[PDB]
Symmetry: D3
Amino acid sequence: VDVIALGEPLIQFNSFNPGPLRFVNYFEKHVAGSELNFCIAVVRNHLSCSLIARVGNDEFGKNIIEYSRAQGIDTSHIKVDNESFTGIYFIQRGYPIPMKSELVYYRKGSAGSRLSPEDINENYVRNSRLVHSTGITLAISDNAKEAVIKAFELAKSRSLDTNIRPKLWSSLEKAKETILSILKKYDIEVLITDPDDTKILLDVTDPDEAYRKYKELGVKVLLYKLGSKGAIAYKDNVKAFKDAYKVPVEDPTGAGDAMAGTFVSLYLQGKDIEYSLAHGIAASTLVITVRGDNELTPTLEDAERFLNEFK
Amino acid sequence: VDVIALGEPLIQFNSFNPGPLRFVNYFEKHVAGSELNFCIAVVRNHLSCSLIARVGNDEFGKNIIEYSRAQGIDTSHIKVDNESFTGIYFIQRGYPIPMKSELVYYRKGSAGSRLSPEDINENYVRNSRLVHSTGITLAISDNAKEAVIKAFELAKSRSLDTNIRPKLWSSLEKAKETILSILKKYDIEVLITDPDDTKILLDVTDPDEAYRKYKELGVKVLLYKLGSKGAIAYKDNVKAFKDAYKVPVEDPTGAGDAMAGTFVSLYLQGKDIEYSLAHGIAASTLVITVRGDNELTPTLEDAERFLNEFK
Amino acid sequence: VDVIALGEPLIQFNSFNPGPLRFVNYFEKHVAGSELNFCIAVVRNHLSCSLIARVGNDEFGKNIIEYSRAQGIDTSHIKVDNESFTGIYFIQRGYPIPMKSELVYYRKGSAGSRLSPEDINENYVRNSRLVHSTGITLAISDNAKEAVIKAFELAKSRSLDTNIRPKLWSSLEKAKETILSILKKYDIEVLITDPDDTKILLDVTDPDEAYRKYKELGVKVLLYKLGSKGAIAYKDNVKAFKDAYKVPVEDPTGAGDAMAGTFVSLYLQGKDIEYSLAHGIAASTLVITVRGDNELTPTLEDAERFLNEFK
Amino acid sequence: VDVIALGEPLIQFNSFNPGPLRFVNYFEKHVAGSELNFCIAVVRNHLSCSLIARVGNDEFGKNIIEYSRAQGIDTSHIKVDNESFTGIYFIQRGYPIPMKSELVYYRKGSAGSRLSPEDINENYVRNSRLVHSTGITLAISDNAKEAVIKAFELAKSRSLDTNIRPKLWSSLEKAKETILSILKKYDIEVLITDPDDTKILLDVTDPDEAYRKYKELGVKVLLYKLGSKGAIAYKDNVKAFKDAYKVPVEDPTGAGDAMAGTFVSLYLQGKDIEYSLAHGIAASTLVITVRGDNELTPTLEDAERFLNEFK
Amino acid sequence: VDVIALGEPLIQFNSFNPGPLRFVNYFEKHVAGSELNFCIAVVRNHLSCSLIARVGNDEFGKNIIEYSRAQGIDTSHIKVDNESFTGIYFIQRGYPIPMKSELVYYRKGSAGSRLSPEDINENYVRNSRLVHSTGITLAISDNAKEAVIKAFELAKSRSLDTNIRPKLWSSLEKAKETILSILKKYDIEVLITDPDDTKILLDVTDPDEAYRKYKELGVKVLLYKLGSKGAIAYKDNVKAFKDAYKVPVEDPTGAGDAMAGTFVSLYLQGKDIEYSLAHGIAASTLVITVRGDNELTPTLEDAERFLNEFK
Amino acid sequence: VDVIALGEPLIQFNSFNPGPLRFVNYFEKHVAGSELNFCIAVVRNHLSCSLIARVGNDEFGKNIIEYSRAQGIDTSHIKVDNESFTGIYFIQRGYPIPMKSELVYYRKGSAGSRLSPEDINENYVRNSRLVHSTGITLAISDNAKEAVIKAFELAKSRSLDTNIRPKLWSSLEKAKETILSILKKYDIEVLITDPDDTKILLDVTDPDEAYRKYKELGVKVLLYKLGSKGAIAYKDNVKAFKDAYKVPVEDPTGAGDAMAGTFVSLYLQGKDIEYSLAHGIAASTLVITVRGDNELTPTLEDAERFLNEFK
Ligand SMILES: Nc1ncnc2c1ncn2[C@@H]1O[C@H](COP(=O)(O)OP(=O)(O)NP(=O)(O)O)[C@@H](O)[C@H]1O
Ligand SMILES: Nc1ncnc2c1ncn2[C@@H]1O[C@H](COP(=O)(O)OP(=O)(O)NP(=O)(O)O)[C@@H](O)[C@H]1O
Ligand SMILES: Nc1ncnc2c1ncn2[C@@H]1O[C@H](COP(=O)(O)OP(=O)(O)NP(=O)(O)O)[C@@H](O)[C@H]1O
Ligand SMILES: Nc1ncnc2c1ncn2[C@@H]1O[C@H](COP(=O)(O)OP(=O)(O)NP(=O)(O)O)[C@@H](O)[C@H]1O
Ligand SMILES: Nc1ncnc2c1ncn2[C@@H]1O[C@H](COP(=O)(O)OP(=O)(O)NP(=O)(O)O)[C@@H](O)[C@H]1O
Ligand SMILES: O=C(O)C(=O)C[C@H](O)[C@H](O)CO
Ligand SMILES: O=C(O)C(=O)C[C@H](O)[C@H](O)CO
């Protein structure tokens, strides 16, 4: 398998319309979770991809495996854990801030949080080209964090999305220290991050300076996401910038995962950072126009159409 | 207040279409929870009713309070608890058994489960006519169980719906020991139960025999629910039976609570057991026709219309 | 035109779900009104049919005109009245009586109620085979009543559905005197009625007795609707009875209209009362399975299929 | 209570989709009416607020009462009137003008319009800090106008939103005389208006000039709404302007109400006009992003978040 | 692989409500086609199953492969055919016959119709335990019929559902002759059929006589479907009857495929005809309660629950 | 009749949500087809308009006729053809290009494609003011192409929208040869086209140059559509340009037809090209805001409101 990702796949319940949850009557279900979204993007760009994860022995767990399998993700290492349930979350859209979303989690002690070093086979990780994970997975439990540590130790190369969700951590200091410690211990082939997380991690928001400090920690490629201002990629003292496109925002949740999975799978295939980046911007632009995270993540050929035709 | 109920109110996510949850795309939100449903039925039959409960300091908790307030439930004693979240559940409908439902809970460690003896004021409880709770509240935590024991000690009179949900107990033996202990300790003015629960508690299913044993336990009035077969009420040496009505079933969830709160509230105001039973059946028939436990619970006058007009 | 009808066409808002209107969030719009439903049945049985009516100079009036035109009703004599609004109503379904509906009208002083003798042209009316109206049109205003009196004076033959809606009259006594007054004055080729109306009008229940007394009033054919118990047609010494079919009921509103239009138009084509009745029953049966009143009114040939195939 | 409002609360039926009503199949029900929307804004900014009004003895009236109660509006003086019906209206969205709405009323002779001096108690009114109403209530009937005259005579302070709806008046000249008559007679602590109304009332457009002429009429604070161009507040020699924010507009209906209730209640709490205005703009901005008028009216603290975070 | 099926998978567009298609506004998409439904039932009973088929190089073709893969069907032999499109059909529900459905096909010259002997690998068919197909596949083109002939020639054992759809054949004679010719050429381990098809094929409707005549053609097991009267299974001069259950019918489409695939996969596993049959009745009962064909097809363990609990 | 259009009207199945069709679950039905959309716009601007077309003897064909009849299109010459089916298509929205759509046709060999010279009566066509068709009708079959050639020979005046859909042609060379041949043969009073089509026909995109070449081909008035850039109209030595308006785009399908039928119908009645152009833009702006090609096409008076009020 080309890419192994470790994480907790989740069921998302997206409010049918904007406003505080107490006034929403209908909820539309999607399959999501940061690494799962990433994996969808990897397969859409024609690399094989496996999600190492746990789900509950329940309908929602089975929904995750079947969906993933439908979309071409290798599910052989998604373990069913009878001891706990499949984690979920709700999205409150556009309140109190228009065009922004807020997540309400029901994932404490979930099957997914029970991801552990025992799930990480040494031969299997070593046969892959790259291992990916995120700061969500580092947050969910000590054993999931240790699973990432073990996979990263065994990996040929690594990618990490910082993805700091302060609600998942006892403190920002803990987030900071946990993520910095991974960056300091391992070379990171592609780091995906943004000004918010980098302020926490490095006390830096400036893109060029971010690259300089992350490069000093052993990061080869920096993908620096700027939201509605676009994104920047850096490799070997070369910068590429691509501006965002103006579209109506339904739900931005998962836009960075579409970008990151697209960027990383194209980069792995030998595409330059300019092309990988423009495709990542294309992927993000499509996903935010709708409620789900990953259904509109384009294939490489569809993303090329987007870039050649969309103005 | 006339009636006090102790319980965990919950947000219900009702599948828009029947079938396994992994194939359901849309969920319709309702406010529910057994004793909440019970309280709705009480106020529909013109007694004041307070729910003693905890909710989270979240949208779903505000939902519960606002909905209760809208429906005329006294919400003075629904406490917002910042330490945890408002419990929720999903309804899977019509699979694997047509016209029945299954519940998937997200309530472990919830705010509602934090209901405790300190939430039970002696002067407030003594001030009421009757105190109601259920085996669900006895199951959700040790402190919620102790809160009911304390409310029952203080009460002028007591109703209990056995409501055994096997998923909420460590074993059926624990359910039996916990519920039997309450029955041996207290007089119960109205006990609401059914064959399934009575099999567990008494190792009998025969209605006459159930009444004989329950009566030895200090049960004055037995409401013995038979689902699509109707229900029987017993008092002293009177036995009243009424058949269920044939209606299309959307979701029978909450049917028992609609019957129980209707029955108890009418019984308390002097109505005989036949009248109370028939209004109970009428309430249950209406609610099972829709998604939603309690919106269709009829007022006294609407249940009379039903009984006079429907065949 | 073969058939002229006088009445008030209306916009119907059905509850998407059963229950008290205060809990209904969605309403589905349909085009209806008793004589409009009747006209749809007439054209489906391959006669030409004109509705004489008023609508407001508003969207809902244009809705009525266009929907009628789409369905092949001659709309030449539906007049736009800029002085008032198109009448509308809401349907509450299945509460407090399952499988039954209640109507909440917003029609007082509507354009439809402004139907008047001046809308009734002598030459136009004399050139049709039959003029139909209902006790609804007799109720809505003094001028609509007078419009029916005038059309009935000029007509070659008449039908009348008694259609007593107690909400539209100041008393049942007022309805009785107004409707008997029509019956006494004119010959009625087809009278459509039922036990409820007949009890008010003639203080009899028994169908055979009803026909004897109606015959004294100048009634040639009696269509006597019995709801879930079927219907009976009488002509001379022929009595025909047909049982209702068991179907899941969504909304019975307009069933009688589909029956009455179907019956009358077949009867006008020389079909005997047995055939006309069976077709009327087929028409009623189909329309009660769904929210709208007239979309499922069968053509002659479709009603024949239903009768041959459905048991 | 801190604030008393007089008006007609209404049931709103919004088109699920944009377009001429004749092509709309689905309508989504919301609870609204100008002074009701205003009351929701008042309570969200943590003052107590009572609506004095009538509703019909019908489902939609119960809907109004329960929704108001759910939202913490004091409903003690919303009277059930068995002699008429609860008024309602429809919203046509985005046709013929995108991002704008048109209202089609069914409210003539409604229970709400039967609001009258006899509903206005001297002691109750004198015991509040402020009485609010609008030019809508002045229009709906002679007695509702008189009810406002009486409440304004007894009040410690008053607010008035001019809210001229040309459909509710026999002429613009009638509106002008009726509303000037109020302004001439009473001191007005907060006047809410806009160029359209001010042009009718004072034959001026320029905001500075408007305030000079309004000040002669006894107006202390002027809130001057400019739609997509923002709003201006005036008090003494303070002028405050705030631009509108760019958001996708679903339905602007009730924006001014959310603004006016927010502004007035903050102003009554000793917030300066700058702060009150910015909060009113935040409230308007949120509610126009969705179908209903008042579900997204922010609390004080949520409006602070919006202001600090949204650009 | 245990079971190979040959057929044309199809996209189904199910009317959201009953009535003639011209009045239906919404269509709900499902993945279906007789053999695909069969394959879902086979995998739900824990045998491996492969669908040999073609789909278009289009979204609907990809929808078929992904859905099938999600549900555990081996899709390695579903070929994408760029020369044509994925076939679809619409279902008109409950008109002109309540509780019955009518299919409108758009499948002429489809990718699926291009199934040919060239798609049938000799080694692959010979490694399987059983090959299944239906009279639909025999109808769709000469080359699909020849594909079935070749697979049946190579198979260890065979199953056939007669599934005569007269719309797909030039005449009933052609259907009859084509199906009889297969029955005469091959032993058939399980034949699934009913009175309608057997009247065409044998001029027999009587179950016991049907068995006798089909046994004389080389059929080992006869599964004889009786709709709302249940179904009968015959093997070695033993009959098993199981009555149907009373449930509300949403859409019966695919009920026989659920039954047949369940029956055949359990029979293959050594279950007796009594058990295989009761499970087939369970599968059919669940699917007809909803719009899709195969989402509610139960697993073996869920079907056991159904049979033990549903009365 | 003033205007005759020749075409294939179609049933549209519009995805309820954006994205790849395999992820869409719900489809909303509309009546569409380019020349049908054109005719709607003609009658909205107060000319009589007949559509010459074939539909199937099926629900979808009856749909088309009834809808056209409802909207005031003369349907005397929409012929029901028992030999084939009514053509349909699906709209995939927002993927892979945001705010654009893609069409998937089910129309090969349709009834509409059977439009032929025999459907074109010489006296009927000569009797009209103008004849319209499009490159779609020229593509669907040889006989439909010949039907347009014949109608154009007979016509007093002609409009043509080039409407090149590459999927409907064997090659772009065939489109170019077929359309160029019509242009060289006939005077064209209004030609509607755009850069994409003009690139194919003339190997130019520059608007001024396009007009120069088209004018040599006997085009009197050129309508040159620029999508989100607006449109230009040319006549003699006048050039009128109007920008597009910024609105949220749901589906731009049919926008060109709304503009074309509006423009042509207004031009025919004496309006100058600026007025006709501006009303065209107004019509197109409205339709792109919803699913559905033609429901929001404005009347003359509504487009004036739009132009006077919208910014
Ligand atoms: N408002 C917007 N308008 C246009 N494009 C946007 C907008 N917001 C986000 N994007 C796109 O989203 C890309 C990545 O967004 P970003 O906020 O960095 O990821 P994120 O916060 O990681 N999302 P998530 O996956 O929930 O963690 C940007 O580079 C844009 O291409
Ligand atoms: N299939 C049915 N048909 C008609 N009435 C029914 C049916 N099922 C239940 N009821 C009615 O509901 C009443 C309560 O039955 P029951 O199903 O035992 O309660 P329950 O569902 O256990 N309630 P709950 O604990 O509140 O989820 C019965 O006495 C009937 O009046
Ligand atoms: N519950 C039902 N079940 C089956 N068929 C029914 C049912 N109700 C009505 N019908 C059929 O409808 C026919 C007409 O019924 P009826 O109740 O007299 O109409 P109605 O009251 O005049 N309806 P309306 O058109 O709204 O005035 C009956 O004779 C039956 O064929
Ligand atoms: N199109 C818009 N875009 C952004 N903000 C808007 C828009 N329209 C209104 N607003 C906001 O709403 C505020 C109030 O607008 P306004 O149009 O004066 O209300 P209104 O006409 O009184 N509405 P109503 O409550 O139905 O009477 C404005 O000052 C803006 O903050
Ligand atoms: N009205 C009904 N009520 C209850 N069960 C039914 C009803 N109709 C069908 N069934 C069930 O469906 C089973 C098989 O139905 P049947 O009509 O033989 O298959 P079919 O016509 O092949 N369906 P299809 O898959 O579209 O080809 C029966 O044995 C019943 O278990
Ligand atoms: O299981 C629970 O706790 C519930 O609250 C579910 C339902 O609301 C109720 O119990 C049905 O009786
Ligand atoms: O492509 C076609 O033939 C259509 O009819 C699609 C649209 O209705 C129309 O062409 C859009 O211009």
